[PDB]
């Protein structure tokens, strides 16, 4: 590419997300309160 | 009908801009991992030990 392309995507990122241990959480301000986000409930991992 | 040349001047006295105090930080177990960037995915991942049954 080029030094003055738009940053592309980050492999660390793709990774990170599709590993699946970043946090969601409920917004806080939304009325009734959510449903809690399926990767808030997924089981520990049996390996690593 | 006489006029005078005075300045408008500005005072500080006090009068703060009201704010919460900071009390969450503290109270929450922080930095038991620091090795973010040096493992893979920027992920460390937390071993919970093993469990028997008879």
Redesign the interface.
């Known amino acids: 590419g080029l030094i003055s392309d738009p940053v592309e995507v980050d492999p660390i990122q793709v990774g990170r997300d599709e590993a699946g241990w970043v946090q969601e959480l409920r917004d806080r301000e939304a009325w009734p309160k959510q449903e809690v986000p399926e990767q808030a409930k997924k089981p520990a991992k049996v390996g690593n | 009908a006489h006029i005078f040349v005075k300045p408008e001047l500005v005072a500080e006295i006090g009068v703060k801009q009201l704010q919460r105090e900071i009390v969450l930080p503290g109270l929450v177990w922080t930095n038991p991992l620091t090795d973010f960037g040096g493992s ?4 460390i ?1 937390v ?2 030990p093993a469990i028997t049954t008879a």
Not at chain 2, 40 to 43: Q, R, Y
């Open positions: 893979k995915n920027d992920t991942t071993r919970v």
